[PDB]
Design a protein around this ligand. Structure first.
Ligand SMILES: O=C(O)c1c(/C=C\c2ccccc2)ccc2c1OCO2
Ligand SMILES: O=C(O)c1c(/C=C\c2ccccc2)ccc2c1OCO2
Lengths: 149, 149
């Protein structure tokens, strides 16, 4: 559980927002890319795994699951690549809810930034600091620290 | 101490590598940029502060310290912006040593990646996982978790 992440791809302003969610905490990292390719997804995962102890990734679709470049990145970074099929159906709804939330926050900051990528990073900040009480940022650190110890 | 980071700018292949080091752990995040501008530094700090609880940043030079855009990002993200003058002289040498180390790792992976940015992220991964025994990634999580609790 401490090492499990889920990929999520959502769209805004004709652009693609790639999101990784740490399933147990709700903590996220995200980037704007022009389109969701294996190459972009691979690079994103490499970045993520250098920054957090990523053991398992549930990929967001079959193209990324199949991608040789994504498989290469997962091999390189020691990530178990899995499918992202919601065997538990409450999963789709949770992802859907998070995308709606992220887009709402993006709307709330959009005028403070010229570029979408900046608004997305503001949204990441607000999401990860939001008190729900602990924040998602607090939860991920606590979860991982408990695991290490 | 849990919230203190140091900026570091180093050069390779006619490009600029911007690094943030969590001083107490040695954990890093890094990006390749075409040149070190206030705009790029501001965006980098926004990303960092959305991902870790960044309280204080020791800026890497006077241009970034002065930059209105960097100041705006620090204000937005709740970061205390400080100078990076090594009042303790062992600091320059530690930064210097880390840049040499990062470049060495980059050299060791450079042929596995077409693009420098990929090699830099491989270097981030290797650096943060390296056991010294705890890794820098383990140290940062432990330090922050102890603070939160
Ligand atoms: O306007 C932008 O999108 C933008 C900005 C602007 C505001 C801003 C950005 C971060 C925090 C507070 C304010 C700055 C750097 C950037 C930007 O784009 C990439 O690097
Ligand atoms: O060749 C690259 O630099 C490159 C690569 C290649 C290898 C690679 C990258 C990550 C992990 C293992 C292998 C892949 C995606 C990318 C890349 O550039 C941006 O997105």
């Amino acid at each position: 559980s401490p090492g499990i992440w889920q990929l999520d791809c959502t769209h805004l302003e004709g652009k693609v927002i790639l999101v990784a969610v740490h399933v147990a905490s709700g903590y996220i990292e995200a980037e704007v890319i022009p389109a969701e390719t294996g190459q972009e997804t691979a690079y994103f995962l490499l970045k993520l795994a250098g920054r957090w102890p990523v053991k398992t990734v549930h990929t967001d679709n079959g193209s990324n699951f199949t991608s040789t470049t994504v498989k290469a990145a997962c091999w390189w970074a020691g990530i178990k690549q899995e499918d992202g099929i919601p065997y538990n159906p409450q999963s789709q709804g949770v992802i859907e809810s998070m995308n709606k939330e992220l887009k709402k926050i993006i709307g709330q900051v959009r005028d403070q930034a010229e570029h979408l990528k900046t608004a997305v990073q503001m949204a990441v900040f607000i999401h990860n600091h939001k008190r729900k009480g602990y924040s998602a940022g607090e939860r991920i650190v606590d979860i991982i620290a408990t695991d290490i110890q």
